[PDB]
Amino acid sequence: TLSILVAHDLQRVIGFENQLPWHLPNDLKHVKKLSTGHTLVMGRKTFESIGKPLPNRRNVVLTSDTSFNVEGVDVIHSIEDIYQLPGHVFIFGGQTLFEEMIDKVDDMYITVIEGKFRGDTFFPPYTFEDWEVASSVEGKLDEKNTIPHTFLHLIRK
Numbered sequence: 279t280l281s282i283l284v285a286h287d288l289q290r291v292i293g294f295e296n297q298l299p300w301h302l303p304n305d306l307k308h309v310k311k312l313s314t315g316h317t318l319v320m321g322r323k324t325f326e327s328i329g330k331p332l333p334n335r336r337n338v339v340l341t342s343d344t345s346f347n348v349e350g351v352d353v354i355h356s357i358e359d360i361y362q363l364p365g366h367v368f369i370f371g372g373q374t375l376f377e378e379m380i381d382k383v384d385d386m387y388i389t390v391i392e393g394k395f396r397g398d399t400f401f402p403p404y405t406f407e408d409w410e411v412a413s414s415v416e417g418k419l420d421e422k423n424t425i426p427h428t429f430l431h432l433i434r435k
């Protein structure tokens with residue numbers, strides 16, 4: 279199973295100056311439940327922006343740097359190596375790798391942030407004519423989650 283896993287705002291912003299533009303604890307928990315025990319694949323810049331591999335799952339970084347090495351991180355140098363990864367594989371970021379993978383994945387787990395943030399990194403355009411809405415769940419607002427958001431699982435028609 280090959281999935282995209284992304285949070286993006288109303289204009290598909292996913293990042294600003296190496297940071298997430300929003301603070302949404304419920305989405306981090308969403309990320310944890312989906313991807314714990316499985317595989318996250320990310321381009322080099324997305325990994326560096328995070329700074330450490332995420333615990334309790336395989337962390338795979340795509341880069342052309344043959345000296346890249348980080349404890350707890352498996353390195354690949356080719357898009358085609360993604361297809362040899364066993365198990366459930368989530369494409370995690372960033373804009374470049376999403377552009378390379380959006381036409382290849384089976385499904386996408388999107389968190390739509392119902393806001394307009396300043397961004398410099400974007401998720402590719404996509405149309406619902408190509409994706410069936412398997413589920414759409416509104417996140418709950420509270421104390422620490424103050425931006426409306428929606429969990430979409432989209433599956434390729």
Ligand SMILES: NC(=O)C1=CN2[C@@H]3O[C@H](COP(=O)(O)OP(=O)(O)OC[C@H]4O[C@@H](n5cnc6c(N)ncnc65)[C@H](OP(=O)(O)O)[C@@H]4O)[C@@H](O)[C@H]3O[C@@H]2CC1
Nearest residue numbers: 292293296297321322323324327341342371372373374375
């Ligand atoms: N929500 C997010 O996912 C976020 C993502 N991060 C932002 O991405 C911003 C723009 O960089 P972008 O190119 O989109 O990031 P990638 O993660 O896609 O990193 C791209 C890198 O992956 C590598 N890469 C991509 N495609 C390939 C490929 N086909 N073969 C080999 N390496 C590849 C290659 O690394 P390298 O220069 O070390 O070789 C390439 O430059 C960059 O500013 C990162 O900060 C944000 C934080 C929020």
Ligand SMILES: CCc1nc(N)nc(N)c1C#C[C@H](C)c1cc(OC)cc(-c2ccncc2)c1
Nearest residue numbers: 283284285296297298306324327328370371389
């Ligand atoms: C969660 C946000 C998020 N949600 C969803 N549904 N999919 C995603 N792909 C990401 C994401 C992301 C990027 C890689 C990112 C950037 C970052 O820049 C600091 C910190 C984190 C991060 C810090 C702590 N724990 C998990 C992830 C993630």
